[PDB]
Amino acid sequence: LRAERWKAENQEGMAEVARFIEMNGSFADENRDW
Amino acid sequence: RAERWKAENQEGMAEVARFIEMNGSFADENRDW
Amino acid sequence: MQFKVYTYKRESRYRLFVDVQSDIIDTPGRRMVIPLASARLLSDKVSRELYPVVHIGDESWRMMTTDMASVPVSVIGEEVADLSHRENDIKNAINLMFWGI
Amino acid sequence: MQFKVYTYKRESRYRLFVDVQSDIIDTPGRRMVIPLASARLLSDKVSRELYPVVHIGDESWRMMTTDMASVPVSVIGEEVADLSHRENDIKNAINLMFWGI
């Protein structure tokens, strides 16, 4: 499936974003009213 | 028609706004930035 | 996991939500979800197109699409239901909030 | 306003966000927005499909589509840009997040 190829394709970048969010901060966190 | 939906929905949109302002926003709540 | 309904482990007016994020989109420790509220809490003036009504056991819930958020795994409880069959209506509620829809 | 970039009037890692909510969906007091991060902060191992690089003047920014969130009108400052010319990329990024490829 094209979708599974994509996931594996962008797994490396998803990690870098995860690390980045932790470091910097999460926008959703500062902002969910429930 | 996009205008009509907005006019049609004006009553309904405020009520969620109100319900959310009274109950509470799932947003200001779980957002981390 | 997409279209699954979980318990909200936090003290708030919301008790349930539904995961609406793609299963192909891996955000470690986070999922984008839509919160549910009892259907009688909102009048019929509220768009069923924007805020769909779903059923989970002995209760009807409105899906607060506009009040969606990403939540930490930490407040994500156990699966209580699966609304994958309502994929069309969920997809329509969301595409409409962002686009004309 | 949809596709406008505004400032974030709050102590935060993010200083800018883009309004990505339909202009016909009026949620009194709140708008759904995607935060911006200095493009320099991320490598290009990170999907541009999911995280579009947009420019404000000569400076490049990454749209943290996944870190999106609705905000109060009260934390929304001055409009600093208009990105209506990236509606395609922006729309594809958002859809990638909910409905995969």
Contact flag A34-C28 (C-beta cutoff 8 Å): no
Q: Which of A31, A33, A34 has the most D C-beta neighbours within 10 Å, making it the best mutation to test the interface with D?
A: A31
Residues 6 or more apart in contact with residue B9 via CB below 8 angstroms? C47, C50, D26
Closest A-chain CA to B21: A33
Domain boundaries, chain B: 1-33
D17 shares contact with chain A (CB less than 8 Å): yes
Domains of chain D are 1-101 (2.30.30.110)
Method: X-ray
**Total residues belonging to chain B:** 33
Residues 6 or more apart in contact with residue C80 via CB below 8 angstroms? C5, C6, C7, C16, C56
Query: Which of chain C's residues have a Cβ under 8 Å away from the Cβ of D19?
Result: none
Residue C51 has what DSSP assignment?
S
Contact flag A32-C69 (C-beta cutoff 8 Å): yes
Query: Which of chain B's residues have a Cβ under 8 Å away from the Cβ of C69?
Result: 26-27, 29-31
Contact flag D24-C68 (C-beta cutoff 8 Å): no
What contacts 24+ positions apart, CB below 8 Å, involve C43-49?
A: C43/B12, C43/B15, C45/B11, C45/B12, C45/B15, C46/B12, C46/B15, C46/B16, C47/B9, C47/B12, C49/C92, C49/C93, C49/C96
Residue C84 to residues C14, C34, C62, C76, D88, Cα–Cα distance (Å): 20, 14, 16, 18, 28
8 Å CB contact between D51 and A17:
yes
**Could you give the count of Cα atoms lying within 13 Å of C41 in the half-sphere of its Cβ?**
20
- 3-state secondary structure (DSSP) of residue D71: strand
Chains that touch B (3 or more CB pairs under 8 A): A, C, D
Contact flag B26-C43 (C-beta cutoff 8 Å): no
- 3-state secondary structure (DSSP) of residue C49: coil
Among residues D88, D34, D40, D21, the alpha carbon closest in space to that of D66 is found at D34
| Structure-token pair, residue C3 | 């279209």
Contact flag D100-A32 (C-beta cutoff 8 Å): no
- 3-state secondary structure (DSSP) of residue D68: coil
